Design a protein around this ligand. Sequence first.
Ligand SMILES: Cc1cc2nc3c(=O)[nH]c(=O)nc-3n(C[C@H](O)[C@H](O)[C@H](O)COP(=O)(O)OP(=O)(O)OCC3O[C@@H](n4cnc5c(N)ncnc54)[C@H](O)[C@@H]3O)c2cc1C
Length: 450
Amino acid sequence: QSVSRAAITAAYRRPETEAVSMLLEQARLPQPVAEQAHKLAYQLADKLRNQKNASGRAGMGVALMCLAEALLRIPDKATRDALIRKGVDMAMRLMGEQFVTGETIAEALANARKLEEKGFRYSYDMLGEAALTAADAQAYMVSYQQAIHAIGKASNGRGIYEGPGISIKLSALHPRYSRAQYDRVMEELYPRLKSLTLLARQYDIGINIDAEESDRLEISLDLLEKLCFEPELAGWNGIGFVIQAYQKRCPLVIDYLIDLATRSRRRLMIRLVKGAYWDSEIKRAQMDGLEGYPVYTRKVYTDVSYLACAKKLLAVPNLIYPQFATHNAHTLAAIYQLAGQNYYPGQYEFQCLHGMGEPLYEQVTGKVADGKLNRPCRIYAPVGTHETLLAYLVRRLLENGANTSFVNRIADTSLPLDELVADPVTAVEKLAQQEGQTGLPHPKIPLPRD
Ligand SMILES: Cc1cc2nc3c(=O)[nH]c(=O)nc-3n(C[C@H](O)[C@H](O)[C@H](O)COP(=O)(O)OP(=O)(O)OCC3O[C@@H](n4cnc5c(N)ncnc54)[C@H](O)[C@@H]3O)c2cc1C
């Protein structure tokens, strides 16, 4: 192939200067909006950093204090005045517990009410991916079915927007997905995806297809195309799909999705993320020695891409329900402003990961009279035991520990607020003036062929 599909293919690995130049004007926040976004980003990050007054306390050595502390334990003011495989496994479960909502779906479901009382929603993810055998893919299949029954019963008719949903990894459903051929995926994967989706629809819950490595995008689009034309799903708008802004294809994937919503007569739930597999995407392309990278090489270019993609998603409310997944205070503020005045609940929502977003979003989800923005947030809730945790944890470690990540830089008390919430288009123009060209690749990440 279709016009919109050909254009996805043609953009696969297009040069970074070219990709970033085309996004720039689509992501530029109009002056007045840009400053409202700066103001709100600044506030959100301020409150975050300075939760228990962590910067005002910073506005006031250690030897002296223990002396002052022991002096204050003297009850009387006068008296005082006058005077390898097991270590990896262990560290994994220790660092990973904060990211897991529970070990079983029922345990996770029972923890749901507290944040749901306040206006949060949930998307449960049964941990596990990259099934190696037929048996593994079967076991994931049954665990997903069980999760739907349990989530659907707790949803109890609340529907796709207000009630809980499920997220699924296609790699969990087909053995050796990473290398599987088109025909075997259709004959074997598709009937399982179709079946879980019919179940989700019987309970009227959202069912989201997660995005994984970039070599898998094309086939996920093929599976999506078919799923949207199932007669049993006609008139149901609960199908969701994740797109990754770090990909050069992302905008073209959107033009495709918009067309698919039109032809299949539905509103798609589209989760926009920046993307979780960047380190592997870079290694992978470097080992193939291909013409270029399928993802951006500077983080700021991903930020620009997200913004451009976000405007595109917000322009077609009849065709897409955007779900903006981020922990970045600027990103959130920009979307908030970009979405225009006259918010209505079903216009869009925010999303975050369990163990990462709560502090940002306690300022966002809830009543205005309590100082919140009154915008719903859906928490993505990993569910499983220690045997299914590893790949997810490692992705969380790369995200949290990267010096370009917002969650890492918010901690960095040396970096001031204004630099943290800086507008990314303005950052790209600043780089462009300094280097002589817009959208040059990362200096330390040369093209695979060098
Ligand atoms: C509800 C939810 C569901 C999710 N499900 C998925 C999913 O299905 N698929 C998936 O891939 N991710 C998924 N994620 C993970 C998500 O992609 C990461 O949390 C997200 O990228 C972190 O972005 P941020 O805006 O919070 O942080 P920011 O710190 O503002 O941006 C972080 C990032 O920018 C990108 N980046 C880092 N360095 C570079 C660089 N040198 N060049 C270009 N880009 C760079 C990476 O995407 C990295 O994650 C999900 C996240 C949420 C909240």
